[PDB]
Amino acid sequence: RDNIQGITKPAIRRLARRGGVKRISGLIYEETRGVLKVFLENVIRDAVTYTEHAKRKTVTAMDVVYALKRQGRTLYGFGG
Amino acid sequence: LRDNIQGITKPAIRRLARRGGVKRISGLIYEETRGVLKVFLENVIRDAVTYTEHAKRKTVTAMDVVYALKRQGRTLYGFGG
Amino acid sequence: KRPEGMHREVYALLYSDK
Amino acid sequence: GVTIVKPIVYGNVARYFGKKREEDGHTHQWTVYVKPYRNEDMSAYVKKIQFKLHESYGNPLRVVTKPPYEITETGWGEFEIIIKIFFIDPNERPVTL
Amino acid sequence: RSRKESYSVYVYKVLKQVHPDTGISSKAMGIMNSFVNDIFERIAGEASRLAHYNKRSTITSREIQTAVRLLLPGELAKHAVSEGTKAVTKYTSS
Amino acid sequence: KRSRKESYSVYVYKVLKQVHPDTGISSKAMGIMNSFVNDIFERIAGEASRLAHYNKRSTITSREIQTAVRLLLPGELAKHAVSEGTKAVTKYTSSK
Amino acid sequence: AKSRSSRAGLQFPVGRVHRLLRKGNYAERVGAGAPVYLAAVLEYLTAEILELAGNAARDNKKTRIIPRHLQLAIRNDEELNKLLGRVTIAQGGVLPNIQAVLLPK
Amino acid sequence: RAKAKSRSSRAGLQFPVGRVHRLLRKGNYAERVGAGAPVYLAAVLEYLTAEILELAGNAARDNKKTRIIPRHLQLAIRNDEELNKLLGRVTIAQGGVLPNIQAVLLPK
Amino acid sequence: YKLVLQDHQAFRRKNWRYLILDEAQNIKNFKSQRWQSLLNFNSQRRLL
Amino acid sequence: PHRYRPGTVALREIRRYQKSTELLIRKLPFQRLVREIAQDFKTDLRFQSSAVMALQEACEAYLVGLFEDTNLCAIHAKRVTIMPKDIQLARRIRGER
Amino acid sequence: YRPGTVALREIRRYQKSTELLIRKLPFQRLVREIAQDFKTDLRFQSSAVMALQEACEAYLVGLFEDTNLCAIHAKRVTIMPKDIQLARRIRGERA
Amino acid sequence: RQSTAEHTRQTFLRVQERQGQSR
DNA sequence: CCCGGTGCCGAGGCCGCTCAATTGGTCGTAGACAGCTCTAGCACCGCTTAAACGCACGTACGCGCTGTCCCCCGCGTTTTAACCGCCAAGGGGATTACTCCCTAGTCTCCAGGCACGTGTCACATATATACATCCTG
DNA sequence: CAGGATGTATATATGTGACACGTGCCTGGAGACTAGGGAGTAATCCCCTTGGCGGTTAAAACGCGGGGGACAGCGCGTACGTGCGTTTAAGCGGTGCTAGAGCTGTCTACGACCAATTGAGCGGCCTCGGCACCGGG
């Protein structure tokens, strides 16, 4: 599949703008892609671990919130 | 007591930096380190005294310090029995 | 259908986290 | 119509080294201080105390932030020290001694 | 349907008490409910930990007070403690 | 009038001596070891309690503890601990 | 007849808080004043955040608290910031701030 | 009655399953605890302890010491990849640190 | 009709004296979004 | 023709996206990436529409914080521009590495 | 000795031992000072004071380890105040 | 209502009056 | 960026039912409080001296400047797919039936946790030459 | 391209701190054995929320050009390190004293617990108006 390139250069540039950067290097996109991939992999692993125990065929925003709370990135807006 | 933050001298801070890997140290780094250590001790001892007063105790035990460090995120082994 | 056939606790531990 | 009186004592102690020091020529140690006359905590209303020394020192304007306020130093001659006590309330005029 | 439950009504009442005319959207209401639930969880966990430390099998108003002290930063702690103590004193008188 | 305090030093030394016949351990190392045991016990038990509360269950079971271990332990330590726990839960229920 | 919330002078559900405390496995015995105190603290924090977000949304010509202004209030208040430090408000955005080094002139 | 067998011996563990179950049942964790939860918890704890003890003993033999001291614990934890992640936010007294000198601060 | 559906707001914000609809058999369904949008327009006279 | 100098449009984009509150990552590509990642954890797992949105919100917030710290580290080196070493230092100080 | 050799020697020396680097008698007085601001006539255990000193030393060692990289980031060998400031800011203590 | 002490009450009323005057 | 017009779907208010909160009543148990004590925390003072403080000197590192070379930045046009609606059906959840697992209580019993004294059993401190390991020539 | 001149190991030793090992205590645990409770597993089945079809423009992407920013070289200055001498209070451990953490013993108000009653809250539905959208200043 290898659809990690969905997080493209313009999207990473807009994220940088929001983070307050006004100039990006040429090798920042491939590093941001890997960092985001690791962060996802971790959160999704926790979510799937919750879902397996829950015996649900559908991963839920509640499982995502639990994974975020475990990773310490508490998120508000999705019922938790 | 007063001005006991000065009981952390330049040799002590330089040994603490050597143990952290720093090779060359500036002049104001010592004041910065004293100020940071004081701010850290302030919170740690505030949590410890909060755990103590609530227990109606007059002595700050080691478990109070352990719980304060756990709250602050600095879990410390070797003093939990 | 659930294969099971073994002890409840051991069975759950073995399958519920394949 | 409210008048509050706070008793304090300000002074200096000095100890003679017995001989003139060869490093800097100083002959006495001295500690200059403000402390309360009563057994009370000055920090509840004093923000800081500034002590202005003679211009012979590398920095003449010293500062202290906790009671009993004092500075320990060394010297060989007598001079006038200006102690400026600042209160927590910025609207209150600091005292000068 | 089930019965998911939230503090929406009480959040709206406090919103009316603080700003009689300023409303709140559904997303904001949900975020506030999540915040309330998270603060409740944290305070209750800290109170249970204090009870376990003191070997008390009960979580009392004093435990809640100490848990709020151990979590709120300074002026916020001093105000929340006053609010809680006043609420408990007014409750004990009825 | 005795004030006896418990600890895991009697079993931490048994495991130590069975996994290293010739190596000992000092008192300070034993205290740090007991602290580590207590900390990980608290972590795993709290995670199992959280899983139970999320699943709307008032009792913690071996399955909750297993998922809690999978969540807590990282990578190739999670698998080891889980295999050990599974093997122990099967050798315990077999009446041996 | 009388809800404990109104008895204590609070708006939050003292009864629901007591129920959640006794059912959340927090302890085997919930004090009479523990849920009242917890509800009072929760109401205080909620009033603080709601007032700040209200007057942050009304500062932008609006009349309805939104996540953007909730985030603005939470990140401008130094106490609420330390409280919800590692928390992220969905659709909250970030604070307008450009470093002087990046700024021109 | 029949000769009483302990749960730790029945399972094959050394850590106290009885005390683990007592803590679990009287603690904040839940109302009541199943028989399998404390066994699993004690087994996991025993495994972690055996691993860290093996690493500490290896460090001790490397340093030419027969008694595991907090140095051998800190070195083991910060040399192991997974135990380091497990105890990243945990400080050990009198444990010290690693001789990790940055290559940029070396003689040139 | 397609562009009218796409920009009904812009057209709805304009007051029209006459609204002419050629080949009106394209709005024969009252449940049609086309019919709804064309009815929600401000027009003084209508010619099908 | 007319073109702005380097640094004028970047500041406009910053001032715009720092006040605008909307997901910057593309929704369908992010969903496809989430599905790819979940495929390596469990086969044939379904995802609620809100779960992907929550994941995207959390990832965007994390990346925004990471880029803030990266810009801080870059300015620390007297560099107005950021580079992978800045992200490396930011994560190192955060404790993620 | 050349400036830096006796410093790398001390680096290798103090990254080998585990004893406390701060003096007890001076650090206990600082602890009692900071405790005075919270409770008058407060007693402290020797174990509690040792745990406080250990926590402080570990925190300062971590802070200096981060400050070393913050300094090296600017092609500098000496750690300056802005380095510890950036360390604290990115840690979240004075953000 | 009582939300927080001096530095919050007065500053908050000032922020409220700010846009009221600007309007 | 600010201002006047239109517009729509999500905010906010009403209806109604039920299940949780409340009222009343009981048991008991953890706790509040006083009694006693004995450890440890506090204070103090002197002999020893290792560490700290102050100062001199210069060497190497910060830091400021300059120059090249390019690697991003802004703008125009070109190509891909994200996005907004319908249509099956696959699952997430209500509803009912029923059993293995745990709770609770009460004896019976193996096991570990210290008080104490005894016997081994590390490695801290001390000592010295061997080895680097420099740095000035 | 050395060699005084330091500093850093390396190895050996011993005796006092500390693991290590009985000796009996017992009281808090650990398990066995009946009886009772109960919640979640399992099987259906109704019902929304996914995953899957075809267009529309809006954003991603490709290219270009030059411009300002990174990185390297270099030099000036000063301050930070190291060594020496003077100074100070830190470590030691010896003695004296009492304060309160802790064990303990007794008596008791508060809360879990159980049953009945009541209205606060919440799903649901509809009407409506605050702000999304937009085109001219």
**Alpha-carbon gap, residue L14 to D43, rounded angstroms:** 32
Measured from the Cβ of residue J29, the count of other Cβ atoms closer than 10 Å reads 16
- Which nt is closest to the CA of F16, judged by C1'? N19
Count Cβ atoms within 10 A of the Cβ of residue I46 and give its class: 0-12 exposed, 13-18 middle, 19 or more buried.
Answer: middle
* Alpha carbons D32 and H100: distance in angstroms, whole number: 48
Distance, CA of H15 to CA of G31 (rounded, Å) = 35
Q: What gap in Å lies between CA A17 and CA A8, rounded to an integer? A: 14
DSSP designation for G86: T
Give the range of the structural domain holding residue F10, as residue numbers without chain letter.
3-96
Which spans in chain K are helix H?
Answer: 5-14, 24-36, 46-73, 81-91
List of domains in chain J: 14-97 (1.10.20.10)
Distance from CA of G1 to the nearest CA of A (A): 32
The C-alpha atoms of residue A38 and residue F74 are separated, in whole angstroms, by 14
Give yes or no for CB of F4 within 7 Å of strand M. Answer: yes
Q: Which bases of chain N come closer than 7 Å to a protein CB?
A: 7-9, 18-20, 29-33, 39-40, 42-43, 49-51, 56-57, 59-61, 67-71, 79-83, 86-91, 99-104, 110-112, 119-124, 130-135
- CATH code assigned at F63: 1.10.20.10
**DSSP reduced 3-state for D16:** strand
Q: Does A72 touch chain G (CB under 8 A)?
A: yes
Residue pair J76/K82 in contact (Cβ under 8 Å)? The answer is yes
Q: Which long-range contacts (CB under 8 A, 24 or more apart) does B7-10 make?
A: B7/K23, B7/K25, B7/K26, B7/K27, B7/K29, B7/K30, B8/B33, B8/B34, B8/B37, B8/K22, B8/K26, B8/K27, B8/K30, B9/K26
K41 touches strand N (CB under 7 A): yes
F94's tokens: 């077999």
Across the interface, whether the CB atoms of J18 and G102 are under 8 A apart is answered: no
Residues 19-78 of E with CB under 7 A from strand M: 23-27, 55-58
Q: Which two tokens stand for residue H17?
A: 């399953």
Please tell me which residue of chain E has the smallest CA distance to B71: E70
- Quote the CA–CA distance of K59 and K56 in Å, as a whole number: 5
Considering only CA atoms, which of G82, A78, G39 is closest in space to residue E33? A78
CA dist list (Å): J34 to A3, A71, D86, G77: 9, 17, 62, 35
* Contact assessment for residue B43 and residue G82, using Cβ atoms and an 8 Å cutoff: no
Count of the separate structural domains present in chain A:
1
Strands D8-16 and B24-25: unpaired
Does residue E58 approach strand N to less than 7 Å at its CB? yes
Q: Between chain I and chain J, are at least 3 CB pairs below 8 A?
A: no
**Method in brief:** cryo-EM
From residue A49, give the alpha-carbon distance in Å to each of A43, F81, H88: 10, 16, 22
The domain total for chain F is: 1
CB-to-strand N under 7 Å, chain J 33-72: 46-50
- Helix G67-76 with E26-53: angle, nearest 10 deg: 40
Q: What is the CATH number of domain G1-99?
A: 1.10.20.10
**Nearest in space to J60 (alpha carbons), one of A59, G91, A26, A41:** G91
Can you give the distance from the CA of residue K6 to the C1' of nucleotide M135 in angstroms? 13
Q: What is the CATH number of domain H4-102?
A: 1.10.20.10
CATH number at residue B16: 1.10.20.10
Are G53 and G73 within 8 A, CB to CB? yes
Spatial distance between the Cα atoms of D44 and H60, rounded to a whole number of angstroms = 54
Domain spans of chain H, in order of start: 4-102
Closest listed residue to residue G72, CA positions, set E71, J21, K93: J21
| A 21-80 residues, CB < 7 A, strand N | 23
DSSP H helices, chain H, are 7-11, 17-26, 36-63, 70-79, 81-86
3-class state of residue H4 by DSSP: coil
Q: Is H15 helix (H, G, I), strand (E, B) or coil?
A: coil
Considering only residues 1-48 of protein chain I, which place a Cβ less than 7 A from any atom of strand M?
Answer: 8-9, 12-13, 15, 33, 40-42
Q: H or E stretch including E59? A: strand E58-59
Residue with tokens 């002490």: L5
Q: Residue I47 is inside which H or E element, if any?
A: strand I43-47
Residue F34 CB coordination number (10 Å): 21
3-state SS, residue G57: helix
Closest CB to A17 among J13, J36, J62 = J13
